[PDB]
Amino acid sequence: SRLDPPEAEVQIDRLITGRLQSLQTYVTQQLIRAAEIRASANLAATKMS
Amino acid sequence: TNVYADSFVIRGDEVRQIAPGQTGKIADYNYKLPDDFTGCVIAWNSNN
Amino acid sequence: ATRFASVYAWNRKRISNCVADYSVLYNSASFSTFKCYGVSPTKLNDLCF
Amino acid sequence: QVQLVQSGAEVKKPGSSVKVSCKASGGTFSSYAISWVRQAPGQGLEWMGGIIPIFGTANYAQKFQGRVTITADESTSTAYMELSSLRSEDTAVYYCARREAYGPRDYYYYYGMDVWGQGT
Question: Changing residue 1 to A does what (chain A)?
Fold first, then answer.
């Protein structure tokens, strides 16, 4: 609402870089936590059987 | 592929406006150049 | 105006509680420089400060 | 309301210099496109120069460039002319003419010459 498209492109690109890096960090954290949950699920299924 | 040669006369102080990302009476109402422009802008003094 | 201040002792007028029509100031032909930072000069009339 | 009046008629022998005033009463002076024109007896009008007092710059015709000096005195709200090297053909009635201004005032947006002088 405040910047015309030629500059808006630089400020938005800066926002894209920060938000994309934060989302990639989130997904990586979910993949590692999920892997530990997967190991726990294998232990729980083995104990169930 | 092809080259376009656009030509016009402008005011000396206004030579700086014939560029990507510029504002002013000429850049806004007469000749707008795109921000992803590929090319060269050529100007010379033609007072004589 | 007719009595601009010196740059070492520049004047400041505070403008408030009013409607700011910037199309008259922006669309004026009388100014040689109109360079905006933080806002674009052609979207100024849609903003509130 | 607004009107422009100048001094009377002068007679000068050839080769001298003539100075013609132009007083302005009413309105907002120094925004007007003050112009100087002349017409030879039995001939059409001929331009010689013009001046905008706020810009402090004077324009002259090629026929009269280097021979006509025009200045505008903002303090008295008056416009002055100095013409030198008068010749036989140069005798004529002299008119001081103005134009209303509107717009940015740096770029030409002006009305017609609604008001004229009484002659010189």
Answer: In strain: Alpha/B.1.1.7
